[PDB]
Amino acid sequence: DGIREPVSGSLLYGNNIITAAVVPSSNAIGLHLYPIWDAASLDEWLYNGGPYQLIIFHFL
Amino acid sequence: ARRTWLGDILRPLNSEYGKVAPGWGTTPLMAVFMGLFLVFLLIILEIYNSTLILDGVNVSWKALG
Amino acid sequence: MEVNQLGLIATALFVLVPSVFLIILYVQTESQQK
Amino acid sequence: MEVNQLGLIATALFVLVPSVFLIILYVQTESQQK
Amino acid sequence: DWRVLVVLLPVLLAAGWAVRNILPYAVKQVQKLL
Amino acid sequence: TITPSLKGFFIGLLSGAVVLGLTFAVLIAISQIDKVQRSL
Amino acid sequence: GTTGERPFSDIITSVRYWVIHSITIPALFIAGWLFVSTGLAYDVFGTPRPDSYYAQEQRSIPLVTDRFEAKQQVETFLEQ
Amino acid sequence: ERGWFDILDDWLKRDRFVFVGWSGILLFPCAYLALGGWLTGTTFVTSWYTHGLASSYLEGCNFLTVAVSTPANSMGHSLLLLWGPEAQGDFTRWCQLGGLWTFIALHGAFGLIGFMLRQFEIARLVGVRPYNAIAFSAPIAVFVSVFLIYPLGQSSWFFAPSFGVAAIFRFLLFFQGFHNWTLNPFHMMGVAGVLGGALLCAIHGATVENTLFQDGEGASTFRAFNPTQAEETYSMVTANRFWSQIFGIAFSNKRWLHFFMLFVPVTGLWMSAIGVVGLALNLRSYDFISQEIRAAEDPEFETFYTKNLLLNEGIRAWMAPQDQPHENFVFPEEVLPRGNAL
Amino acid sequence: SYPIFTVRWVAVHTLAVPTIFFLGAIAAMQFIQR
Amino acid sequence: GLPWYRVHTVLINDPGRLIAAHLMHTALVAGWAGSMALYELATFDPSDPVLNPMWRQGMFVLPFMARLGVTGSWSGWSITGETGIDPGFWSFEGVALAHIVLSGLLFLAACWHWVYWDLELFRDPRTGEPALDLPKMFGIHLFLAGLLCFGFGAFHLTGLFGPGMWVSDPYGLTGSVQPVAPEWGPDGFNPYNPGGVVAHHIAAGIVGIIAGLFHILVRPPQRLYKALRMGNIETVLSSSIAAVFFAAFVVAGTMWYGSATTPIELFGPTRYQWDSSYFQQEINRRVQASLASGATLEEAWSAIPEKLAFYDYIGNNPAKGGLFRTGPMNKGDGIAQAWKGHAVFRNKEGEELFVRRMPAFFESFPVILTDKNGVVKADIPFRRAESKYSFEQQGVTVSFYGGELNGQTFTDPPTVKSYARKAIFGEIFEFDTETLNSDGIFRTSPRGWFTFAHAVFALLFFFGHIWHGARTLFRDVFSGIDPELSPEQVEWGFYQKVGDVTTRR
Amino acid sequence: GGRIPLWIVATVAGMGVIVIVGLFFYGAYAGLGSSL
Amino acid sequence: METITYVFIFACIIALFFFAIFFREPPRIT
Amino acid sequence: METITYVFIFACIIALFFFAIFFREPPRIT
Amino acid sequence: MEPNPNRQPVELNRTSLYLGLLLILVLALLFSSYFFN
Amino acid sequence: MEPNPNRQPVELNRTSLYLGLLLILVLALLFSSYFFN
Ligand code: CLA
Ligand code: CLA
Ligand code: CLA
Ligand SMILES: CC1=C(/C=C/C(C)=C/C=C/C(C)=C/C=C/C=C(C)/C=C/C=C(C)/C=C/C2=C(C)C[C@@H](O)CC2(C)C)C(C)(C)CCC1
Ligand SMILES: CC1=C(/C=C/C(C)=C/C=C/C(C)=C/C=C/C=C(C)/C=C/C=C(C)/C=C/C2=C(C)CCCC2(C)C)C(C)(C)CCC1
Ligand SMILES: CC1=C(/C=C/C(C)=C/C=C/C(C)=C/C=C/C=C(C)/C=C/C=C(C)/C=C/C2=C(C)CCCC2(C)C)C(C)(C)CCC1
Ligand SMILES: CCCCCCCCCCCCO[C@@H]1O[C@H](CO)[C@@H](O[C@H]2O[C@H](CO)[C@@H](O)[C@H](O)[C@H]2O)[C@H](O)[C@H]1O
Ligand SMILES: CCCCCCCS[C@@H]1O[C@H](CO)[C@@H](O)[C@H](O)[C@H]1O
Ligand SMILES: CCCCCCCS[C@@H]1O[C@H](CO)[C@@H](O)[C@H](O)[C@H]1O
Ligand SMILES: CCCCCCCS[C@@H]1O[C@H](CO)[C@@H](O)[C@H](O)[C@H]1O
Ligand SMILES: [Ca+2]
Ligand SMILES: [Ca+2]
Ligand SMILES: [Fe+2]
Ligand SMILES: [Mg+2]
């Protein structure tokens, strides 16, 4: 939600199968396309929900 | 098949497979008992449900003891 | 995470017991004369 | 007693995995044409 | 209650009218079944 | 003694018996008037 | 095949059907209308008229709270 | 021989437009009264005295908001018979007390028994196996668990579903907020069976319609079928190859395919019924204890599971005063949970 | 030639007769004002 | 070959191996009972029937032994808190041992009946085919069930030759095993009258003996024999399953609502006792009588038994649990140690205030305090910026009467608020949360778990009834419909009566 | 009898449905249930 | 341990997909 | 849980003894 | 001993193996979270 | 495919089942104490 309040989605970060998710990209991004190469680093890309966009656009 | 002492004693109790009384037999008597039983179940249900409330019958823990 | 310590054995046997049952039945079907 | 929490699953799988292997082999031998 | 008579009257006047246009064939269907 | 709800119980019991009795009396009567035809 | 009854298409295209039902259908419709317009529906089923959900001063709902004297409780709620 | 019972059996089983049968003696009165009771209540009957709600066309509701609502919580699980100790034979009072709810629920239950008996009876007369009756056990399991067992486990019929469109939607949201019912694996299996059943319905219908043999000259292909024909009307072989190459697996046995189409939705509904029996006792899948321990100790730990509980807490606090009027809840503004601004 | 009153006839009217009555009632309701 | 879901059908035509399989099933169930009792005895803490009774400890079979008169251990304790009792052989341990030995003997008998399956007894003497005369078997078994039912009621339950049954006062304070005389009037059908349980078994037993003799001596009518397929053992399976799901719904119901056979000292209180404030009313009644007798407030509340206060606490409500919150109730709120006493809240004007209690529906609940008329006087706010009713603004204090905290008053707002949060659960207790590493989340009791399993099993057995009834009545088409099914038998118009070729038009 | 063509029966019956359902939608905006 | 368990079950399902597709019983026309 | 485990294994061994003796492959002269 | 004529062979074909293993593994993937709790 | 001629049936007779189960159960009875530790 772009309010610097990160939601843990992955199994290794304390989720089970029922609670885990791949979390949407940040509200600060809005509808902007956010590919890996627009981030300063993978660490940044992950904080901001980059994986979600890669997944849903390739999936669709 | 194997005969045994106990099997021979019990043999008459397992010898009338398929035997029937003619026609409807005691079916009318059976239906009367089924109807009485339906009414009995309806009575005990409605007592437990407090739909049927009887003198001296307090359906609660706090009746007595 | 403070998970239930019996969750692991519960899940393991939940998988293994019926899976093994089916594998036993499958293999002895294959070995029957064709 | 404060036993190792993995002792139960270790013992269960130690028994189950090889026992099941043998049961599979036995049953599919019995089902072969005689 | 006048309100009940008011509501019933059209229905009764309808069933009375339908029986007057079917009594020639309803008595015939009744006697036909013997 | 016969409480109000036991009187109500008897009313419901009699009402159900009347409904079932009338239903079967009518069905039996109709089944007798309009029998199926079978060949010899 | 069929089951012996007259076909519905036969019935509803016949003059006699419409002689009968040009009366019975409007009569039933008018009877239902009057069931409401006379106000009888309110009293049969106990449904409040628009001016009868609340008394003028209180604004509390007449909820039934007593299983076996509920009938007398709605009656007390109705006298208000 | 040929006595009155057999003469009655003859008449009951006549081949007529609407088959009757012995089962019809139970089915037709109970189905008619359950339906007639619903139309009567939704058209004319209030919920003012049981719920504080208007619920009929007469009061101004529309098709989406009318209902036959449950009795007041103070009625407990009373059968609420018209001649019973609550209404005491007063039809008007009976309606105001919620008597039409138990009337519909109970005539509905016995009607459903009658319908499944009808399924058995007709199958036996026509000479088919009674799988349709067996599949109908899933509707019965749902009706009995949701409309009878669930309220019987709770405080009263009040918490059963009310018979109406919006009333049922409220039931769904009550189950989310109070039971966290979406988290329950028995509901999840229900969802899988319903959505999987709908998937099978669509994919099987489409596959048959798109592997048809050309059995006529028309571009509209429905006429090129004869019910008495011996031949399959579509190619199982072509359908099997298509799905094998598209999806990786395909049906090859038509009998298994059609059994599976029954098995999937029937089993899903049965699983959802088991979960509701649990919820009759508040035996919920409400929480994950390990999540709660971590979140209580670590105020930076957040998952979609903790997010949904916050939504449940709002549902409970904001809906309970009006949804549970017998509780006389007064929640001052300052205690209501809410986020910033909203 | 055809019977007029059948089981079908009864089933039709147990539904049709109240439906028209109800539709007249609901029609009247559209003119009620608070 | 047979698919996996039909392997047991090899028993249908083999009465001897069916008996063997039934013996093995019986051995497994008896062995479960023995093992379950031993596991419970190895884990049960008998030292406190007041605040740690069996139903707080997840005990499932212990209450069933106690209900029928097994109340003592060979180690010297009894479930009513006695010491130095001699139970004889029929202690909890003796019952468990007996079930284990029974299991082994049934297992051995199963082996014999499996090997020696081909007994002449199981052959029809005329045809030489396997045959069971199920109508006469029913009479024999019904006669035996009637005798046992009658004897259970006439000798065991009465104490005439046996121990009696568990009975208690209306508040579950003084329960014990007692002889119970039968109740032959209408109150015998009151589910809360134990004398009706005694009368039931005497009267139903006698009826069972008579009906059994009828069923031994009178053959079924031909019309019923054919309609119910009385030559097909699967008809018995169908109707037996029906009777069993009926019984299972009944025991689920009487467990959930309570009856003379589901007493609260054995299975825990019911949810309805919380809904109706059953225990709170009796507590308040007793306190008011003490006060009217001149007692001080401290004396009046100190006269309340800890056991009565503990029932007036939502952690013992069976509708507060979770499907996957496993184990004993003690694993949630902890092992109860002592009543803290009755908390009385007051504001700075000295008006007594009452905490609104949590209904069972709510996993969480706000803290709201009202005066005696239900007017809100204090609460714990969420948003603070427009708070009017905070404990700080209203000067809320809490004083305790009875229990550990008797005579104490707290004024520090966080402490007062802490106690108010416990008061939404009813009476306030001190818990040991360390011994079991309790997690603070409510679990249900054996009353709840029993009800859940038996309602679920009953519903599933409805499917089994439908399935086997179908297989019984449609056996001729189980492999499919007649390949040359007359199209006139399913089309319309050909037969006057559906499925009757003799009614061809 | 076939004196009244089925397509006329269908057309008139259908128009009747439209009229009465139309009345019910009118009633959503006037009188009870209109929010006004 | 719980993460290993979840990923293990998932991995077994994916392996099952592979065998169910490429090592299925071949459909045979008769 | 450890006592249950030990007693369970022991019990399985005793059961095996029973089957090994009374349900052995019968020795047959050929 | 004389042979029991009621014995029958049992079968599980490969498709049924795959369907059953899928059911078991998916049920385990579903229920395991609740077992760990 | 053309059939692989190197395949062979596999066998485990009942005595070998009993010997193997005895080995496994006794090894488990022996080692379980050290697994629980
Ligand atoms: C035919 C199928 C059928 C079935 C299965 C039901 C079933 C039911 N009805 Mg419905 N009903 C029906 C048709 C049916 N009805 C019809 C045709 C009408 C229109 C008249 C109604 C109108 C109706 C109303 C107005 C009400 C019900 C109600 C009920 C419920 C309570 C019934 C009861 O307690 O009876 C008890 C009676 C019996 C079970 C009869 C059994 C008779 C036994 C076998 C023989 C005994 C005879 C007796 C000894 C004779 C002497 C009596 C003497 C002691 C006075 C039950 C769900 C009540 C309800 O739903 O409340 C919520 C209710 O208020 N019904
Ligand atoms: C009617 C049966 C029954 C009931 C009501 C009880 C009740 C109780 N048991 Mg006992 N027990 C039983 C049978 C039962 N037990 C059996 C058969 C055994 C041998 C395994 C035991 C061994 C046992 C032990 C060792 C312990 C208990 C304990 C307890 C207490 C806690 C229960 C709990 O946490 O459950 C939790 C229940 C669940 C989590 C629900 C499981 C639901 C399953 C997994 C659903 C499966 C779905 C299925 C796979 C889907 C199929 C789909 C397909 C058809 C398509 C409670 C009083 C505990 C206690 O406190 O003892 C003092 C304890 O330690 N029990
Ligand atoms: C008295 C109870 C009872 C008895 C004796 C039977 C007996 C039978 N059933 Mg029926 N059935 C019952 C209740 C019963 N059923 C119930 C309650 C249901 C609904 C769940 C059914 C639904 C049913 C179906 C759909 C079918 C049968 C079939 C059969 C026949 C073969 C069963 C078989 O080979 O399984 C072999 C089973 C296995 C190899 C493994 C099953 C494992 C289960 C699913 C999980 C483990 C359960 C656990 C061990 C149970 C503990 C006890 C429980 C009470 C808690 C056999 C005559 C079959 C039939 O008609 O064949 C012609 C068949 O298709 N039954
Ligand atoms: C035969 C058969 C079956 C079994 C049938 C069985 C077991 C039938 C047994 C039926 C029994 C025990 C029926 C008992 C009925 C007793 C009744 C109806 C008692 C009524 C008493 C009343 C109304 C008393 C009223 C009063 C009260 C309460 C207060 C007093 O002050 C005033 C008074 C006397 C009016 C199966 C299982 C269904 C299988 C198929 C075939
Ligand atoms: C309850 C009760 C009873 C019963 C009654 C009855 C039986 C009734 C019935 C009633 C009825 C029987 C009614 C009906 C109604 C109907 C209606 C009201 C309809 C409407 C419709 C519409 C509105 C339509 C719509 C639509 C659709 C659906 C789709 C297509 C399109 C349209 C839109 C057109 C008695 C007396 C026994 C007892 C007491 C209680
Ligand atoms: C031989 C012999 C002997 C011995 C014996 C013994 C030692 C026995 C034991 C036995 C036992 C020891 C048994 C046990 C059993 C058990 C069981 C049978 C169980 C079952 C279980 C189940 C079935 C479960 C299920 C489930 C689950 C798991 C989960 C949850 C859900 C449910 C519940 C479903 C003697 C010495 C006497 C001598 C003679 C000979
Ligand atoms: C978690 C525990 C996991 C343990 C897993 C253990 C897996 C064990 C796999 C056993 C492999 C058996 O493999 C099986 O061998 C038999 C012969 O013995 C083959 O059987 C083949 O030869 C026999 C000769 O008698 C013929 O009757 C049969 O028609 C033919 O197909 C099967 O086609 C094959 O499937
Ligand atoms: C309606 C419930 C079913 C009850 C069936 C009992 C049938 S009763 C049956 O009726 C015949 C009439 O001719 C007699 O000949 C015969 O002797 C009599 O027993
Ligand atoms: C298999 C071991 C058997 C051990 C037998 C010990 C018998 S002990 C004996 O048992 C009776 C039971 O009612 C008691 O009444 C009696 O007082 C007691 O001494
Ligand atoms: C500020 C803390 C006030 C001290 C008393 C708090 C209420 S009471 C408190 O409640 C705990 C559960 O929360 C129990 O585990 C514990 O035994 C009990 O002392
Ligand atoms: Ca005005
Ligand atoms: Ca701790
Ligand atoms: Fe199909
Ligand atoms: Mg309007």
PDB file of C-alpha atoms in Angstrom, chain D residues 4-33:
ATOM      1  CA  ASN D   4      14.728 -34.730  20.898  1.00  0.00           C
ATOM      2  CA  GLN D   5      11.649 -33.525  19.020  1.00  0.00           C
ATOM      3  CA  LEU D   6      12.788 -35.218  15.796  1.00  0.00           C
ATOM      4  CA  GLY D   7      13.116 -38.625  17.484  1.00  0.00           C
ATOM      5  CA  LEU D   8       9.470 -39.480  16.804  1.00  0.00           C
ATOM      6  CA  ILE D   9       9.514 -38.726  13.073  1.00  0.00           C
ATOM      7  CA  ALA D  10      12.939 -40.353  12.763  1.00  0.00           C
ATOM      8  CA  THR D  11      11.716 -43.583  14.345  1.00  0.00           C
ATOM      9  CA  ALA D  12       8.426 -43.587  12.418  1.00  0.00           C
ATOM     10  CA  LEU D  13      10.106 -43.214   9.023  1.00  0.00           C
ATOM     11  CA  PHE D  14      12.885 -45.633   9.975  1.00  0.00           C
ATOM     12  CA  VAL D  15      10.187 -48.254  10.559  1.00  0.00           C
ATOM     13  CA  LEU D  16       7.773 -47.284   7.804  1.00  0.00           C
ATOM     14  CA  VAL D  17       9.952 -46.733   4.738  1.00  0.00           C
ATOM     15  CA  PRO D  18      11.803 -50.104   4.684  1.00  0.00           C
ATOM     16  CA  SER D  19       8.793 -52.064   6.015  1.00  0.00           C
ATOM     17  CA  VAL D  20       6.636 -50.673   3.193  1.00  0.00           C
ATOM     18  CA  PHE D  21       9.345 -51.526   0.664  1.00  0.00           C
ATOM     19  CA  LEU D  22       9.196 -55.167   1.793  1.00  0.00           C
ATOM     20  CA  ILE D  23       5.380 -55.282   1.877  1.00  0.00           C
ATOM     21  CA  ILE D  24       5.271 -53.949  -1.700  1.00  0.00           C
ATOM     22  CA  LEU D  25       7.659 -56.668  -2.880  1.00  0.00           C
ATOM     23  CA  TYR D  26       5.877 -59.440  -1.002  1.00  0.00           C
ATOM     24  CA  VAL D  27       2.354 -58.618  -2.203  1.00  0.00           C
ATOM     25  CA  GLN D  28       3.404 -58.266  -5.832  1.00  0.00           C
ATOM     26  CA  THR D  29       5.146 -61.665  -5.562  1.00  0.00           C
ATOM     27  CA  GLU D  30       1.951 -63.303  -4.256  1.00  0.00           C
ATOM     28  CA  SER D  31      -0.095 -61.789  -7.096  1.00  0.00           C
ATOM     29  CA  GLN D  32       2.179 -63.209  -9.802  1.00  0.00           C
ATOM     30  CA  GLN D  33       0.849 -66.139 -11.818  1.00  0.00           C
TER      31      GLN D  33
END
